[PDB]
Design an enzyme around this catalytic site. Structure first.
Site, PDB file in Angstrom:
ATOM      1  CB  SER A 131      -0.730   0.070   1.082  1.00  0.00           C
ATOM      2  OG  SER A 131      -1.969  -0.981   1.083  1.00  0.00           O
ATOM      3  CD  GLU A 170      -4.109   1.820  -0.265  1.00  0.00           C
ATOM      4  OE1 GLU A 170      -4.679   2.179   0.625  1.00  0.00           O
ATOM      5  OE2 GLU A 170      -3.563   0.674  -0.320  1.00  0.00           O
TER       6      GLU A 170
END
Length: 201
Positions: A131, A170
């Protein structure tokens, strides 16, 4: 070609949104990614437990992992890009996690040499997905920040529009995704380790 580093949220959302529009992620792909964003440990934990063997996963997590894996057929970087991830000393492993920070919160310089010996100019593979964010400022207080340089064509995608936490900007990268650590430095304030890592697929 240059690697793009977005200088602000507006520009970052513009680029991310433009790419996200081309994905055509399925409904189950989107739901599996959203679930991951709610608490990534519910996916990355089982992946670490099973050392990446999706076949040892609980059936519900296996179904989500297959979906998230599949989603990357649709999500590739359109340009060389810079991505960021913050982390804590546990990233460095048990032998360093409690020694790398001095009591006074600065990086232990001597231990950092051993951290470099273990990690610098070597590849590392994590069993979890990676991530990252398009932006770095939110990591300015973390003990470790990694700048990922990811080339055009590499798997990964901007997922902010389907995230449980919109505004994190993200960009999710695959699991079992080897990266090369090309640089490691103690920050100017002596309180952070700055890592650069390179991904080419």
């Amino acid at each position: 070609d240059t690697f793009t580093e977005f200088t602000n949220v507006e520009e970052a959302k513009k680029w991310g949104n433009a790419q996200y529009k081309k994905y055509g992620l399925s409904k189950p792909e989107q739901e599996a990614i959203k679930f991951y964003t709610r608490d990534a440990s519910k996916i990355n934990g089982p992946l670490r437990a099973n050392q990446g063997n999706e076949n040892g996963l609980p059936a519900d997590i296996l179904q989500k992992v297959k979906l998230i894996d599949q989603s990357f057929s649709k999500m590739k970087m359109p340009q060389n890009i810079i991505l960021f991830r913050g982390d804590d000393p546990a990233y460095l492993g048990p032998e360093f996690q409690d020694k790398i920070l001095n009591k006074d919160g600065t990086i232990n310089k001597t231990v950092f040499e051993q951290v470099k010996a273990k990690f610098l100019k070597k590849d590392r593979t994590e069993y979890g997905y990676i991530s990252t964010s398009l932006m770095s400022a939110q990591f300015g207080g973390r003990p470790i920040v990694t700048k990922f340089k990811v080339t055009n064509g590499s798997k990964g995608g901007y997922i902010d529009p389907i995230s449980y936490f919109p505004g994190q900007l993200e960009v999710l990268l695959p699991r079992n995704n080897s990266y090369y650590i090309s640089d490691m430095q103690i920050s100017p304030n002596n309180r952070q380790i700055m890592i650069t890592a390179m991904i080419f697929k």
